[PDB]
Amino acid sequence: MIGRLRGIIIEKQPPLVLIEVGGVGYEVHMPMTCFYELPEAGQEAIVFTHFVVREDAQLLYGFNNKQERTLFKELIKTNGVGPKLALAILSGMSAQQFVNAVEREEVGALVKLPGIGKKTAERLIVEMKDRFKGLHGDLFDAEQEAVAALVALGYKPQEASRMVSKIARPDASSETLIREALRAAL
Amino acid sequence: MIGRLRGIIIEKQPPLVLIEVGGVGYEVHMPMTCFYELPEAGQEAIVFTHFVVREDAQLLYGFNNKQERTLFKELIKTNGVGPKLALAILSGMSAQQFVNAVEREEVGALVKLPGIGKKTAERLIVEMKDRFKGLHGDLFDAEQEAVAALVALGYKPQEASRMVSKIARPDASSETLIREALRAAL
Amino acid sequence: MIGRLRGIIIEKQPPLVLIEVGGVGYEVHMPMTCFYELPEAGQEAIVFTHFVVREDAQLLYGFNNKQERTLFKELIKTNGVGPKLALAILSGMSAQQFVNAVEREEVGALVKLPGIGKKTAERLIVEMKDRFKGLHGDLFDAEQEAVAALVALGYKPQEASRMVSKIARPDASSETLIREALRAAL
Amino acid sequence: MIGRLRGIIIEKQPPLVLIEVGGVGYEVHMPMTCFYELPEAGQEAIVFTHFVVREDAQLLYGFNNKQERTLFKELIKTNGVGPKLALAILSGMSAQQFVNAVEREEVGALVKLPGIGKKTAERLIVEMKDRFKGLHGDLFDAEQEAVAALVALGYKPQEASRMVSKIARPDASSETLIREALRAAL
Secondary structure (H helix, E strand, O other): OEEEEEEEEEEEEOOEEEEEEOOEEEEEEOOHHHHOOOOOOOOEEEEEEEEEEOOOOEEEEEEOOHHHHHHHHHHOOOOOOOHHHHHHHHHHOOHHHHHHHHHOOOOOOOOOOOOOOOHHHHHHHHHHHHHHHOOOOOOOOHHHHHHHHHHHHOOOHHHHHHHHHHOOOOOOOHHHHHHHHHHOOO | OEEEEEEEEEEEEOOEEEEEEOOEEEEEEOOHHHHOOOOOOOOEEEEEEEEEEOOOOEEEEEEOOHHHHHHHHHHOOOOOOOHHHHHHHHHHOOHHHHHHHHHOOOOOOOOOOOOOOOHHHHHHHHHHHHHHHOOOOOOOOHHHHHHHHHHHHOOOHHHHHHHHHHOOOOOOOHHHHHHHHHHOOO | OEEEEEEEEEEEEOOEEEEEEOOEEEEEEOOHHHHOOOOOOOOEEEEEEEEEEOOOOEEEEEEOOHHHHHHHHHHOOOOOOOHHHHHHHHHHOOHHHHHHHHHOOOOOOOOOOOOOOOHHHHHHHHHHHHHHHOOOOOOOOHHHHHHHHHHHHOOOHHHHHHHHHHOOOOOOOHHHHHHHHHHOOO | OEEEEEEEEEEEEOOEEEEEEOOEEEEEEOOHHHHOOOOOOOOEEEEEEEEEEOOOOEEEEEEOOHHHHHHHHHHOOOOOOOHHHHHHHHHHOOHHHHHHHHHOOOOOOOOOOOOOOOHHHHHHHHHHHHHHHOOOOOOOOHHHHHHHHHHHHOOOHHHHHHHHHHOOOOOOOHHHHHHHHHHOOO
């Protein structure tokens, strides 16, 4: 449920940051390429977070923008790749370099990074390439926002794209598109 | 344990809202019909929430008033219907339209919505109609507040209504009714 | 981990209170006898809490003082008695009345309350009477504080009382007693 | 995820402290040797914490500095030793005394403390002595910070020390060391 923290950077111990919100000091685990961009200790930072809930522990993974978080969330969906590994992948290379290596199927650039291997590198590339097709954008709009909303409700991507086509009126909010699209389907 | 959030709306990405409380950014999942009523980003919002705790994740579902939340809480009690489905039901129609479709047994209005079907639509109507009888009101008072309190303590609805009858004195707080009713039963 | 809430009472719906701390609205479940003593909506309240963590849900039980909470914590240790039942026991009678009924073995006063029975009433009395012997006090001091600390560390009650006797110097902090007692045992 | 609390000390009940952050009262369990150093009730305290998450409960263990917390975290990794026992070990002796007793293999100093025994005392000493070798320091630097970061990413300690040697340039940030070391390995 915790999507964003805004507070004072108390300490940096890569890959860990300690952000103070109120008087609560959150431990945020961040990939090294996001780590370089952090403000200075004593200054306010805004980090986008991904809460991983376990039975044994509760952890916050933090990123500087939503595109990096989505990438990380996409990455941990593939069997064999978890938060620590995803943290290492985005430490060894930026999000843009990772997407570029996925698109050009560079399965030699990723094999060096610890904990994955050769077959999982290959499976990661195949799988991520497939996931990027339907993924957001600007690294990988009202009408697109509206399809996403509909997919979130339970419609299948293609059928949601169908619904947001019939009433798709350029220069119109994503919400009215969702309202209009849902109205003419029930 | 989290029943209400009051903070600044940071971002809207239907059905998700990001509300900032202190410097903590909560991700709230809201049905589309509540979503339309939200203030503008940068303005304060008050949302009634339902915390769902899992072993893998922790989520907040948010509504603009308590009646919608109760409806949602009632809805997720029926096997086959979970938070995502309940979110879709209250996206496709308002709470009032849903109660009206339940009372008039319109099992054609709900069949269109994704993820449920025909038999579950039918079971939903039967089950919700039965639950509404004893449900709060104004969509579906000191004396009624007092019966509820007693049901919460473990008394059965009918016996709790019995207790709040013998001493039921119009123009008197629900608490004194609970105090008086509990006193003359022990 | 949440032991106390101090905030604004937003709504009362016995046995539920909604306390706002920051802009976070906590749902606190309180026994009716504590409920009567709450300030008025819009005014600040201080409630002592007991966090019950489950896999399905996370709940706060609240009391006006530490003695009531201890009683509640003691109560839920007995098989057959859980938070809802303990909530009902402290709703039907005050903490003082409950301790008095336990000491005088009144197993007719408790049998009326819903959800327990006759054998569990009897077992509750036997068990609570045994637990009160070693329990805190004022309803059921530096030297006593110090024994408690030592019991918490893992010493057995009798041996901890032994340790805080040899160096027990009236008119001296519980901490120095713990320091002195631990020093002369290792 | 909670690494630090900064708030007002409300009550002390060794080994428990109640720290108020906002209007939220956190129960922090602290070893007695850290307990002696706490400010006075009504004054601000800064405690370093270790959140233990269970299915039944959620607890905060607190320390005055990071070295004590690391020790505690190291301690609870050994089978037979849990938070309560670790709390007792750091109550009976300071962190420095404990490290000294580990280095000099004093397995008579620890045998007195309740809940452990003789074989676990012996195993604790062997195991802690082995863990201290690679452990931080000042009780047990940019280049060392950088190796730690790399170990956290998944590299093995020796190979991470190899990487931070080839480009190890005295008088240079730990982050650039991590950036430079990661660059010349992929």
